[PDB]
Amino acid sequence: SRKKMGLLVMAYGTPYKEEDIERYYTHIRRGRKPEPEMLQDLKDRYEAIGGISPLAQITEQQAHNLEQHLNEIQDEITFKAYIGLKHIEPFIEDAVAEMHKDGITEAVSIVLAPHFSTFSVQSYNKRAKEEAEKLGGLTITSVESWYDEPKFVTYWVDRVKETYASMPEDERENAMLIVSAHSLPEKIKEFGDPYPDQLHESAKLIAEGAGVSEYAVGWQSEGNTPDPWLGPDVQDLTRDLFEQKGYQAFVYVPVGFVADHLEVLYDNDYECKVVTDDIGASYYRPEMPNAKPEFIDALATVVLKKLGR
Ligand SMILES: [Zn+2]
Known about the structure:
Bound molecules: zinc ion
CATH topology of the largest domain: Rossmann fold
Main location: cytoplasm
GO molecular function, one term: metal ion binding
CATH class of the largest domain: Alpha Beta
Family: Belongs to the ferrochelatase family.
Structural class: alpha/beta
EC number: 4.99.1.9
Subcellular location: Cytoplasm
């Protein structure tokens, strides 16, 4: 009696093994193969954060935990998860084609990134739709942004509360909360991209929920292009913030990301850690959503909200 639907979970993509690093970054760098040194540096970082295999993994766990959860919290629809990545196979078009081939005709998609941006989300969505329109006999309703879904906000708030709870009294009274997301070229402002505002909004929601009156919005992981990127970068923000007020502890909430990937384990847990360690402040960075039940239910609700269920 159930209606079959495709669950197109989209993401970035992540190397599966060390030997993928090259083509992965080459894809990311639009056909520009990293120099031998970059390559060696990149392998080192991945080794430094615990290896690669666990990364691509999380996304797979996120898709399937959601597929099963959605299939048990309601009995009108039976979902079948499909992973569409951006920089590695299975690519978005690939997933779409598979669904079509499997006979899917009605699908709903979601990107594993809370905030909407013309650069990423709109693109993954427009690509998924043009693939379906190309094959025909397949429609897709795409979720644009879910950074504001209450259960998702609740997740970050609860983690932050525990982190502040864990602090000594003197740190609890002199800490700084740094909410962040992947940086993006400033040019997106040309199109009125809500990305920056959604981040600030995520930051206002979380701080307000955890009862934090001292916090700042920042960006990280910016790429390499002549044109300027969204800032200030978390490294400079921390140092500058310490410079003017002298916070004894910093809390990083990379709300933009949903798991333990490079951008967090290294760019946060190492780069920001280097700076807090230099200024003598304490480093804190709450557990990422990953495939945890609480997170899956939030995503599940977002999908059901998108369907009017
Ligand atoms: Zn990046």
